[PDB]
Each structure stands twice: as structure tokens, then as C-alpha cells.
Amino acid sequence: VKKEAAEKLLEKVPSDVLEMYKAIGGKIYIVDGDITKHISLEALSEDKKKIKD
């Protein structure tokens, strides 16, 4: 009789395609602190306000 030999049908593995999608990449955006300056006097005042006759 003649031997099969068996060279196989399956080629490589999914693992390369699996690794392709497995890509995670970079996520999220900068927020919160930004720059922050601010300056004006809407908080408190100062002006002569007494009483007399």
C-alpha cells in the first residue's frame, strides 16, 4: 500500500488575526485644569459709607 504522508490542510493560526484586533491603542482626552487665570473685584467692595446728621 501507499502511505498518506499527511502534509496537513490548516495553514498558520488565527492568533495573528486575533492579535490584529487585540490592538488596544490610546484612549481619553485632556480635561479639568486647562489654564486658569481670573482677576476682578466682584467679590468684595471698598467705599466710604458712614452716617451723619
Binding site: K3, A5, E7, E11
Partner: protein, 51 residues
């Protein structure tokens, strides 16, 4: 008793087109508002620097 000696060469041309869509959201900052308003004086004296 047999002995089989073999060799293979191979090519592969893989073309791929990928479409992707993403919708991000933050539950605390979903919406921003804007009002369209007017000021009405039904009184008798005028008022200045209205806030």
C-alpha cells in the same frame, strides 16, 4: 519501508477595508443650555444697569 521528502512555497495577498464608528458620552455633562429671553418693563420709573 518508505521515506517521503517534500517542500512547499506559498504566497498570500490580504486586502482589508475596515469601517468603524464610536459615540462617546459623559453622563454628568450630556447637554448644554441656551435661553432666548427678553426684558419687559411694566412699571413707571425706568431702571438702569439691569441685571
Amino acid at each position: 519501508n518508505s521515506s517521503t521528502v517534500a517542500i512547499d512555497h506559498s504566497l498570500s495577498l490580504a486586502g482589508e477595508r475596515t469601517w468603524a464608528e464610536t459615540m462617546g458620552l459623559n453622563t454628568a455633562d450630556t447637554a448644554r443650555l441656551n435661553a432666548n429671553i427678553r426684558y419687559v418693563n411694566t412699571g413707571t420709573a425706568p431702571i438702569y444697569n439691569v441685571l
